[PDB]
């Protein structure tokens, strides 16, 4: 099932990095196998309420822990295929005192790199880029 | 069922982009078929509690991840048919220091494009347009 | 049941717009018929846990998506029958830098229209009008 | 049961307005009768899981929609019997730039009316009065 | 059971006001009797799912409504036995522009009374006193 | 079981104050005995759904009420064994206008005491110390 | 199972500190053994609903209490393998008035240490480093 999940993530374009793709495929395969094993164990008569409760609590805790990284990855996926944010475009993010000015040099799944006027490298999180006034000159 | 969902989204006007419409139709059809298969499997006697718990946890996590994009799409759908926000209207969004001034040029489902006085293209998220003082001159 | 729901929304005064009233009546009738059909299907023995879980997840996601519009509609309903906010009253909303000044010209279920001193049309969301210091001169 | 609920709300002092009291009594009576009917229907064998799920989802959505009005009403109920906020007392609410100055003239369940020095009528929400530094001169 | 709850709240020191103590005792006794009656009704065979769902929804709504008052009461209970906040101590609460300066005169379960330099009576909520920099001179 | 819980809290180092330790031990012992009694009552056939629902609602309400105190205690436990925050260290907490300057004199589970330059005693909550830029000179 | 969990945390790289690794391994082993014992007890017929409810409530309360520490640890894990934040790099975190300037000297799982120009040691939480504009000179 690992190969099937790898192919699915490759085709759907959710994850492009090979290492992240492999990790996600392994995690998904393990989760599916665990769910199937729990269902099979519950079919024959063995109680599964404590196991389900513990698994759900742990999964909810882990998901709440990874909220920022998940939001950043979702923003990176959504912002893909945007004409304004392209290498060589002098973009400007933010309104008021919290302003960011520079030129796009590279895109990542956790940060957006902008080259300042003095040469400093700015790491703007994609979540902040999503919920802000993006000005393209 | 894919064709039926495509027709429903076309008629109801929730989604107008053909690619987004096709993707939503495929996702909805897959979800409905999965729910029907799970119900059928639970009918004969096979336990479905772990499968339901895992599916619900994953769905909740994904839905919480896509909160910003969902809110933006809802704002884009709601703001449709508004007289103030039309091409050629010199609108002004925001009060205080966080002010945005320009002329509407194009509307998207993720951004609202305003042409500044100097020519810079402003990308105002529709969610911010919803919860702000919109001034039309 | 559509006619009964239409009459109920008309008499209770929750929704006054005919199009919104018809849409709400259709949605409510469909939801009630779906719930009755699901209950009938569960009565005879067919499992309904996956169907209920999927329906609840989808309903919760949609309800969370429409939070801003729902809040605005609730504020519009509540603010009805207020003496301060009436056509021709020079109201003033907000304290500090985020101040709004003008004369009320028209009321909507999504915006409150104020005519500025220079003639600009202000669209103040009803939710912001609810949770702010409203000054009537 | 409507008369019993009306008497209970009258004696307990939660609601004093006759129209609000009648509306709350009718809503409570309808809810209790619906719950009893659902319990009776579930007693004989008819499945009630879809009905309970739909009713709970709708009730949660409506309760979340009315959060601001509920909070304002609770603040109005709690602030009752306070010596500082009485007609003729030159109170002052807020610290910093968001300050409100005036004399109390009337009290409502949704707003607190203060007469400014120039004669403008201020409508301070009771929720803001609860969570603020109230200065009485 | 009312007397037992009254004695328990008196000994545990959670509530000291006789009227609040009596009200809490009555509410707790009613809740316990209702829970026992519901359990007894469910023991013999009568369905209790709709009753439990309605009671839980109503209780959750009421608890969410009273969040501010509950937080204030908890802060008042916790801040008890603090050396800094005592009658005659020139305390100072807040940092930056939102500063409060005065002398403690009396303590309540909803407000903290400070006498300003000019004689104005300040009502600082206990929740704000909990989460702020308290400066004692 | 009270002695066992007291020993466990003593060894694990979560609670060091003897009075808090005794109170926590008593509460934990009572909760465990109540849970065991409820499980035993449910084993023989007596319905426990209303009792479980009421207990869960009350526990959730109480836990949400004590959120600030719980967070402060957790911050106090976590910050233990930190070299920067020690008696005699001229620490500085906060950035911008909300700055706090002084010397550490004593540590508590609810406040952090700093001696100002003029002699005023500052009570900085541990939660604010956790989520702030701590500057040690 | 303690050794297996220790090996798993060592290989997966989630926890590198030996003491934290041992504590996490012990906690995970205890939780798994408790869940298995509860499932076995529920298999034979003994009711487990009160035990599951109490365990879930306690686990949720503890998880909500440790939210800040969990977020900080997740940020520390995610930020690993970042080129910008390395010893000897003059980084700058924050935009506007809340700015932090210094040179990275050491990295921890709870704080990020920066050496100021005057020699003061800055403790920037990793959570704030995640959601901020990181400027590398």
Author numbering:
A (entry chain F), B (entry chain G), C (entry chain A), D (entry chain B), E (entry chain C), F (entry chain D), ...: 1 to 137
Which passages does the manuscript contain on this structure?
Further examination of these TM3 kink regions allowed us to identify a point mutation, TcMscS C66L, that demonstrated higher tension sensitivity and sufficiently abolished channel inactivation in excised patches. The distinct inactivation processes occurred in the wild-type and mutant channels motivated us to also determine the cryo-EM structure of TcMscS C66L, which, surprisingly, was nearly identical to that of the wild type (root-mean-square deviations (RMSD) of ~0.4 Å for all Cα atoms, Fig. 2d). Thus, the structural basis underlying channel inactivation in TcMscS remains unclear. Nonetheless, these results demonstrate that the TM3 kink region in these MscS homologs critically regulates rates of channel inactivation and recovery. Moreover, the identical structures of the wild-type channel and a non-inactivating mutant, C66L, indicate that our cryo-EM structures unlikely represent an inactivated conformation. Inspired by these simulation results, we experimentally introduced the D47A mutation on the non-inactivating background C66L (D47A/C66L) and measured the activation pressure thresholds of C66L and D47A/C66L relative to that of the endogenous EcMscL channel. Consistently, the D47A/C66L mutant channel maintained the same unitary conductance (448.1 ± 11.5 pS, N = 5) as that of C66L, but was activated at a higher pressure threshold (PMscL/PD47A/C66L = 1.95 ± 0.51, N = 8) than C66L (PMscL/PC66L = 3.70 ± 1.24, N = 8).
